[PDB]
């Protein structure tokens, strides 16, 4: 807000992987403050991304995450009388947030019926470079590229 | 109009109740009702005397009414006369052991509702309201008081345009709870309508 830069909340590490990054992904799945249900679905996905592909879920998950991180985004700023889509770098804190949110949102677009499955399948295709989350990243990345001419309007 | 009643803000802190007793669920209403009729009876009669507080205590089917007043004689009567004369009328309505005492008022100018009633009475007598308040605050502070504030509201002097006039001196910390402040209010009926008088006296901070 106005006064001072607020403090970032560090999440209590997950009990299956001891990972602060995994905890975040969990919370974005959490509807209605029902974390336990969100815990299953994600861990269930760890089960699924093991069966349909014999390797470490944490390795699947984390690599999938990196492939969704946008390095450049466009933030609107109506200078003069027109709305300019100013290109901006994305801080790692936001790169994390946007990748995770999109990753879960991309999951909820898929046609597979169980939540456990979708999370797996998106995380599966994400590390392999596909999936709606990576589609959104590439989009937002080209938009900032397209508007490279407004580099001098950056804050 | 935003300020809180300064009495209820201090109950159990700097000010003590005026009906001190326990009662279960099924009797509270009936006992309180009598406490209203009794106050109703006395405050009606004892204005002449200069009523300051009507304390009430209870045990079983009996009640001690400790009545503070500046003129004990108007309460006492001729030799002990009136003090009992009411006690029969009192116990007529009460129908029980009415222990009707009379307590001294050390300084009547350090009694808020007394100061109020006085001023309210004065303005029923066409008295200079601007003056009247300035005097009461002046008399209260001479009585060694630590603070004083007096407010009069309504058709002051008979003017069709209503006006709220006030005066204060020393300290009157209404935001403090440890600050002991007496408050009293009196209604001044006239030919042109109701006038309201409030009194704020700051005795001392405990």
């Amino acid at each position: 807000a106005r006064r001072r830069r607020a403090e970032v909340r560090q999440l209590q590490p997950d009990l299956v992987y001891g990972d602060v990054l995994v905890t975040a992904f969990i919370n974005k799945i959490m509807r209605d403050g029902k974390k336990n249900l969100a815990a299953r679905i994600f861990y269930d996905a760890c089960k699924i991304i093991q069966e349909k592909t014999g390797q470490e879920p944490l390795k699947v998950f984390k690599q999938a995450v990196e492939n969704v991180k946008p390095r450049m985004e466009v933030r609107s700023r109506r200078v003069g009388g027109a709305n300019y889509q100013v290109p901006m770098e994305v801080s790692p804190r936001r790169q994390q947030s946007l990748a995770l949110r999109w990753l879960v949102q991309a999951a909820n677009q898929r046609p597979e019926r169980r939540a456990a499955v979708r999370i797996a399948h998106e995380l599966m295709d994400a590390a392999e470079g596909k999936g709606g989350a990576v589609k959104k990243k590439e989009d937002v990345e080209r938009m900032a590229e397209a508007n490279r001419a407004y580099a001098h309007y950056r804050w | 109009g935003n300020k809180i009643h300064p009495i209820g803000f201090r109950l159990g802190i700097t000010r003590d109740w005026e009906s001190r007793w326990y009662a279960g669920k099924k009797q509270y209403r009936h006992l309180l009702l009598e406490d209203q009729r009794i106050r109703g009876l006395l405050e009606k009669e004892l204005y002449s005397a200069g009523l300051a507080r009507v304390d009430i205590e209870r045990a079983a089917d009996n009640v001690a009414v400790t009545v503070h007043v500046a003129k004990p004689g108007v309460v006492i009567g001729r030799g002990g006369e009136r003090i009992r004369v009411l006690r029969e009328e009192l116990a007529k309505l009460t129908g029980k052991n009415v222990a009707l005492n009379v307590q001294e008022v050390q300084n009547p100018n350090l009694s808020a509702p007394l100061v109020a009633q006085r001023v309210a009475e004065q303005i029923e007598r066409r008295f200079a309201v601007r003056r009247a308040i300035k005097q009461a605050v002046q008399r209260v502070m001479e009585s060694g008081a630590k603070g004083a504030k007096v407010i009069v509201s309504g058709r002051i002097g008979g003017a069709e345009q209503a006006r709220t006039e006030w005066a204060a001196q020393g300290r009157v910390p209404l935001h403090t709870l440890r600050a002991n402040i007496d408050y009293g209010f009196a209604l001044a009926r006239t030919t042109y309508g109701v006038l309201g008088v409030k009194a704020y006296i700051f005795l001392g901070e405990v």
């Binding site: - | 001190r20 007793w21 326990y22 279960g24 205590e57 209870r58 045990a59 001690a64």
Partner: protein, 97 residues
């Protein structure tokens, strides 16, 4: 010997719960100490002003505290001196066996 103390005021309840336990522990013999029973609270919610103004309320409450004391080794050495005990007005007392 079951003395139960009910009152709107605990400063008088605990003060009287002193005077009671003091007397029978003096005049023999055993009194099981003053236990502070949980207080029963009757809260009232009221609209501040007389007309409309719904979203402005004031909070009131009525706190009937409770105390309990026992006399373990009774004996009528106490049964008359307790019968002569200066009880405040804001308190109700019960006796049992």
């Amino acid at each position: 010997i079951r003395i139960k103390l009910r009152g709107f005021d605990h400063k008088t309840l605990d003060a009287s719960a002193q005077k009671i336990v003091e007397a029978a522990r003096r005049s023999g013999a055993q009194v099981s100490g003053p236990i502070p029973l949980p207080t029963r609270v009757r809260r009232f919610t009221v609209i501040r002003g007389p007309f409309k103004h719904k979203d402005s309320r004031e909070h009131f409450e009525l706190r009937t505290h409770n105390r309990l004391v026992d006399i373990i080794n009774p004996n009528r050495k106490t049964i008359e001196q307790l019968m002569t005990l200066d009880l405040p007005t804001g308190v109700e007392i019960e006796i049992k066996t």
